[PDB]
Enzyme design. Structure first.
Site: not given
Ligand SMILES: [Ca+2]
Ligand SMILES: [Ca+2]
Ligand SMILES: [Ca+2]
Ligand code: NI
Ligand code: NI
Length: 357
Positions: A149, A255
């Site tokens: 991220e 994910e």
């Protein structure tokens, strides 16, 4: 009355020769029915929480390996590949990383030469974290989420403490360090969410392209794929996979979960029986099209990991509660909260190939 997940054909077997099928786990899920489901349906694992930086090194030199070790032992015993989540991340990052040897916060340092000294100290701390973790788990991990991220949703790099103190050098040094101690055989990923959003996709592409042109060892891109029933589009997902393939990079779906709601997940249901059957059917239709895309792009995708096992354990429950005054559930998987198969299970186990024109 739908059958239980342990009574139906294996997901991982259905996707042999296409991609591994993975699940995110906690150590306390490695017993009972959840372990039975894992062994039957999945051939890849990731630690939902036990391997993040604050779990492993909450204080400098205080290593907490027990939970991560339990996941590694399970993967060994049941022939499951293991992804590593995650070596470097801005989220819940241990504060001690960013404190100088005087006890002051590096982010607040205004003296230029001291800022340079903080950068070197922080990078040494990051290098030692990566070195220790990779040396312990090198022969058990086959995909490393080296950084997580690092792209901002509003454009450009995320201005986390890592970035404020080191610029982009923490990304460069993280990959170089993982390669140094993992060897040329370690597969190194940059992981992010909303990689299907064209502007964020392009920012990640531009970052990775520049790093590759500088010799930074990056092998693939992780697409978190926290998606919804109506967003993002199949075409944007396809475009994103192909753009990173064009750089010679592997893609992994890391994910995956499909919320019943939009973002924010307002108006969540407070009980699983309040979920209308038509909503689970819409989820089934979307999962069908999603895994049809994955099949078409199987050459570009080495593994597809769900961020959990069955609907009784998902971080999306906490997200629902956060936006609905402390109450709310979500149901993002192909196995429901009692471990019974959902319509989505049938639609991704099947061999349907008639298209949807
Ligand atoms: Ca593949
Ligand atoms: Ca749930
Ligand atoms: Ca299907
Ligand atoms: Ni595999
Ligand atoms: Ni279909």
């Amino acid at each position: 009355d739908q059958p239980f997940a342990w009574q139906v054909a294996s997901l991982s077997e259905r996707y042999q020769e296409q991609f591994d099928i993975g699940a995110a786990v906690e150590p306390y899920q490695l017993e009972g029915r959840q372990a039975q489901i894992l062994k039957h349906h999945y051939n890849s694992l990731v630690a939902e929480n036990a391997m993040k930086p604050e779990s492993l090194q909450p204080r400098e030199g205080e290593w907490n390996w027990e939970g991560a070790d339990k996941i590694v032992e399970f993967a060994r015993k049941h022939n499951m590949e293991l992804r590593f989540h995650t070596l470097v991340w801005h989220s819940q990052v241990p504060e001690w990383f960013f404190i100088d040897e005087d006890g002051n916060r590096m982010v607040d340092e205004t003296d230029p030469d001291k800022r340079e000294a903080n950068k070197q100290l922080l990078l040494e701390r990051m290098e030692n974290h990566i070195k220790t973790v990779v040396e312990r788990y090198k022969d058990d991990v086959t995909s490393w989420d080296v950084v997580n991220e690092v792209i901002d949703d509003g454009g450009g790099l995320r201005e986390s403490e890592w970035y404020q103190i080191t610029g982009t050098d923490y990304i460069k040094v993280a990959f170089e360090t993982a390669r140094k101690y993992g060897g040329e055989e370690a597969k190194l990923y940059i992981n992010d969410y909303n990689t299907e959003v064209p502007s964020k996709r392009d920012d990640l592409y531009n970052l990775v392209k520049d790093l590759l042109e500088q010799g930074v060892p990056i092998d693939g891109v992780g697409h978190q794929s926290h998606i919804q029933i109506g967003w993002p589009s199949i075409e944007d997902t396809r475009a994103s996979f192909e753009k990173f393939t064009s750089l010679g990079l592997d893609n992994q779906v890391t994910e995956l979960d499909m919320s019943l709601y939009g973002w924010p997940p307002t108006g969540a249901y407070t009980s699983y029986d309040d979920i209308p059957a038509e909503l689970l059917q819409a989820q089934a239709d979307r999962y069908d099209q999603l895994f049809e895309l994955y099949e078409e792009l199987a050459a570009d995708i080495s593994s597809v990991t769900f961020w959990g096992i069955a609907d009784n354990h998902t971080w999306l429950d906490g997200r629902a509660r956060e936006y609905n005054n402390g109450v709310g559930i979500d149901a993002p998987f192909v196995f429901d909260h009692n471990y019974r198969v959902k319509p989505a299970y049938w639609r991704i186990i099947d061999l349907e190939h008639h298209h949807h024109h």
